[PDB]
């Protein structure tokens, strides 16, 4: 599920940055109703991605951690990608949040190589940028 | 609406390639129930994107034609893009069909410049490909 991936990716980030995370952290983070969060967490608990105890709070199972880290890698690769090709900083999160779920892993890998391509030599970055310049010259 | 864009893009292609197009052409093309197609066409008629008459069949209004052509440009740019970075031919349509709706126009433009970048010089294409080679060498 697409919103599943959002939850897993989000819970992953919440645990990582806060250590302790709850249903409230997810709600706030996703701007969703906590009751809806609970229902989701329960399905996730059922599919054995996580564990939601008292003193424990949310804890990702070994399986949740592999997937979660994969989703986090994917999300950040997409941001870097869009940033690299010149998308306006303000547009990135939104676009990345939508497409991340409709890209195959085979594509995610090709996007990875593509980022490497530009990352290993600025000459390439300047040639790409110069295309954007001429493309938008009628507005400068 | 995302499925709206699919319909408009599809009706556009159907008119272009067949001249005459009906509700049945859409159903078949989108693998959707025709009754559902009718309901959609009626909303589209209401928002003045198209005209659905007897001898006329489906006809895009001047407005439907600008948007439709824009959606068709977008869809094909995405295919070319993925193909250009090495995504397996079999994966392209699916990935393109999902992401096309969650990319801003600002991104679609940067994707355009990026395609130009590689299209104007094969040297660039060979350097990108060589990255994919080394990336997958453990499987050759
Ligand atoms: Mn994400
Ligand atoms: Mn998302
Ligand atoms: Mn399409
Ligand atoms: Mn689509």
From Swiss-Prot, chains A, B:
Disulfide bonds: none
Annotated transmembrane regions: none
GO MF entry, a single one: manganese ion binding
Deleted gene: phenotype: Null mutant is very sensitive to manganese. Mutant also displays increased sensitivity to cadmium.
Binding site for Cd(2+) 1: 6, 97, 100-101
Binding locations of Mn(2+) 2: 9, 75, 97, 100
Superkingdom classification of source: Bacteria
Activity regulation description: DNA binding is strongly activated by Mn(2+) and Cd(2+), but it is poorly activated by non-cognate metal cations, including Co(2+), Fe(2+), Ni(2+), Ca(2+) and Zn(2+). In the strict absence of divalent transition metal ions, MntR has a low affinity for DNA.
Keywords recorded for this protein, A-Z: Activator, Cadmium, Cytoplasm, DNA-binding, Manganese, Metal-binding, Repressor, Transcription, Transcription regulation
Pfam name, any one: Fe_dep_repress
Compartment list: Cytoplasm
Family annotation (PROSITE patterns): HTH_DTXR (PS50944)
Binding site for Cd(2+) 2: 9, 75, 97, 100
Domain (HTH dtxR-type) ranges: 1-61
Record InterPro entries: DtxR_MntR_Metal-Reg (IPR050536), Fe_dep_repressor (IPR001367), Fe_dep_repressor_sf (IPR036421), HTH_DTXR (IPR022687), HTH_tscrpt_reg_MntR (IPR022897), Iron_dep_repressor (IPR022689), WH-like_DNA-bd_sf (IPR036388), WH_DNA-bd_sf (IPR036390)
CC per GO annotation: cytoplasm
Subunit description: Homodimer.
Described function: Central regulator of manganese homeostasis that regulates the expression of both manganese uptake and efflux systems. In the presence of high levels of manganese, it mediates repression of the manganese uptake systems MntH and MntABCD and activation of the efflux systems MneP and MneS. Binds with high affinity to the regulatory regions of its target genes. The manganese concentration required for activation of efflux is higher than that for repression of uptake.
NCBIfam families: PRK03902.1
Free-text comment on this protein's domains from its UniProt entry: Contains an N-terminal DNA-binding domain and a C-terminal dimerization domain. Contains two metal binding sites per subunit, site A (corresponding to metal ion 2) and site C (corresponding to metal ion 1), which both contribute to the metal selectivity of MntR. A large metal cation is needed at the A site to correctly orient and position the C site ligands. Smaller, non-cognate metal cations bind at the A site, but disrupt the C site, blocking the full activation of MntR. Binding at the C site also favors Mn(2+) and Cd(2+) over other metals.
Family matches, as PANTHER family: IRON (METAL) DEPENDENT REPRESSOR, DTXR FAMILY, TRANSCRIPTIONAL REGULATOR MNTR
Family, per entry: Belongs to the DtxR/MntR family.
UniProt-recorded name of the protein: HTH-type transcriptional regulator MntR
Organism of origin: Bacillus subtilis (strain 168)
